Design a protein around this ligand. Structure first.
Ligand SMILES: COC[C@@H](NC(=O)N1CC(=O)Nc2cc(OC)cnc21)c1ccc(OC(F)(F)F)c(F)c1
Ligand SMILES: COC[C@@H](NC(=O)N1CC(=O)Nc2cc(OC)cnc21)c1ccc(OC(F)(F)F)c(F)c1
Ligand SMILES: [Mg+2]
Ligand SMILES: [Mg+2]
Ligand SMILES: [Zn+2]
Ligand SMILES: [Zn+2]
Lengths: 311, 334
């Protein structure tokens, strides 16, 4: 197990882009992150069991454009960053933080590049995580107490279910209440709410990097959406505007996504942790950048085709 | 050999709609266009009127054709299409009630010759590129149009190509002065200078005894022929627009490579085609055909087709906004 400093000198920084790491080194980096957060020694995890677990999780992702292993790795890496930079041990229990990180690895297992059209996919993701744990040689919790095994499973379920946007919108009022009155380490409701907020923060973490990352991730997202839309047209159904490559206008859809979903998540994170202010400011800056390049979705000159036949 | 040994077709046998304003001369295969030129001159009666030697005329037509290059728009098929429209104006507007036979003959020959040796580049490009044409003609203005005329003159003075070598001294001179004036009238700068005069003439009415009115009418008709692609269906205007912008953006690329800053309409990174087409059509094309309508009521269908083609450019404007991902399938262009 590599020390985390040897992977990259900037590995624990919010400026690091985990998609820069070759896919063949990501399994080792997972182990290095668990080592550096001290969960392997804390919970006495068998290293071979953990290695096999991590490879099975990786293997359980398919290869659609966005919802693949590198997404899961990136999300997991952001959880690590929150641990390292926001001092999560002052707010949550070690078992809750451990659950969040394992959930990050597992939260989109067996995604097909298609959406829920509750929480159909998120329940499947959890069921896949459970099936991996009950595979021979992969149960990283098989030495946990009956109390702790149960808690771990309940946490993973709650945290993975919190990645459904529908869940986040139900609890949004509660998150705002918590942010304004202030976090209370003795309130078990606040722990639940904070774990949901942190999970969604990890899931959308590509929005906190530079322009190069948001642009590429947007491309991959729309590639998935339009594939789904193509399939829905082939079956005789009528896809949503954002799934239809002939009707979707990307700048409007991105700016909506960023104003209405991403920015309020990181605004809430900022209100609870002042050291997350740079995260919110990067998301806001990335949204400004989407507005600046909007004009480029009007074809100037002739299309690359070099033809006007498309009229 | 093929132009000679096929005799001169009657124009009805080329197509039953050949003399109609709805006919698209770009439909005719390029290998039949030389014969169609002869058929049009035959049907307007200029061959018998002026006693043109047919072999001389056949060789003249092939030399004119040969004198066009192959840029996207300014090629032989443009010249043929412009000449065909002149024929249509003769057939449909009864031009013999307004102009002399020699003026009408000059207009048609000018139509064939008016873009000779065009390189897909405009007048200012010759000056910016410091081409041989600029060296010869830049102090006089209308650089390309002067070259076109000089090329026509060089064809006439090629052995076996002088269709006017049997003209009187008076008529030879008149013909040359007409071709020069008419070809120079294809410069947009010329048209904008005379526009006030054309409007005057349209409102007071045409006067067959006013020699200034003949000059002005020949300029108007020449520009009407030059822009005649705007009077056909949507399929023609769309395709011609494509060819025009191809030429413009090639020129713009060349101007960037020399360190100069091209006009917005020449710059493929700044030109927004719907705005430029609509401007061209509202400000250049439509007033030309409005003036033609004011002088000849039977040209009303021409103006109405140009206006309808402009409405069509407005309807499809929205399609220049990229929906979904580009064909690229990539967002790298941001
Ligand atoms: C299928 O969506 C996957 C993911 N979307 C995402 O990353 N992006 C990024 C982007 O750049 N463009 C986008 C455009 C868009 O529609 C216009 C939707 N989503 C995105 C996502 C996960 C969990 C969520 O739930 C919660 F936010 F609660 F975590 C959530 F909302 C969204
Ligand atoms: C190099 O120009 C060639 C020709 N242009 C033309 O046909 N098109 C057609 C089109 O579809 N789009 C256009 C757009 C545009 O600006 C964006 C300019 N021109 C065009 C032309 C010849 C003589 C002229 O002078 C006069 F009109 F007076 F005859 C004249 F103005 C224009
Ligand atoms: Mg998901
Ligand atoms: Mg010209
Ligand atoms: Zn995810
Ligand atoms: Zn022309």
């Amino acid at each position: 197990i590599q020390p985390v400093a040897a992977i990259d000198s900037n590995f624990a920084s919010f400026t690091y882009t985990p998609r820069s790491l070759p896919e063949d080194d990501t399994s080792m980096a997972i182990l290095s992150m668990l080592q550096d957060m001290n969960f392997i020694n804390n919970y006495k995890i068998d290293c071979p069991t953990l290695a096999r677990f991590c490879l099975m999780v990786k293997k359980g992702y398919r290869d659609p454009p966005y919802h693949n292993w590198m997404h899961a790795f990136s999300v997991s890496h952001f959880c690590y960053l929150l641990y390292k930079n926001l001092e999560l041990t002052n707010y949550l229990e070690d078992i809750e933080i451990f659950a969040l990180f394992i959930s990050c690895m597992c939260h989109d297992l067996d995604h097909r590049g298609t959406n829920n059209s509750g929480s159909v996919m998120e329940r499947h993701h959890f069921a896949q995580a459970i099936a991996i744990l009950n595979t021979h040689g992969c149960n990283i919790f098989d030495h946990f107490s009956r109390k702790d095994y149960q808690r771990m499973l309940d946490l993973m379920r709650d945290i993975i279910l919190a990645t459904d946007l529908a869940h986040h919108l139900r609890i949004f009022k509660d998150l705002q209440k918590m942010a304004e009155v202030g976090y209370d380490r003795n309130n078990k409701q606040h722990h639940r709410l904070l774990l949901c907020l942190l999970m969604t923060s990890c899931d959308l973490s590509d929005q906190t990097k530079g322009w190069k990352t948001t642009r590429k991730i947007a491309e991959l997202i729309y590639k998935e959406f339009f594939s789904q839309g193509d399939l829905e047209k082939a079956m005789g159904n009528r896809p949503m505007e954002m799934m239809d490559r002939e009707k979707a206008y990307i700048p409007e859809l991105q700016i909506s996504f960023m104003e209405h979903i991403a920015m309020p998540i990181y605004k809430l994170l900022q209100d609870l942790f002042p050291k997350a202010a740079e995260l919110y400011e990067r998301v806001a800056s990335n949204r400004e950048h989407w507005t600046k390049v909007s004009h480029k979705f009007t074809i100037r000159g002739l299309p690359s085709n070099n033809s006007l036949d498309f009229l």
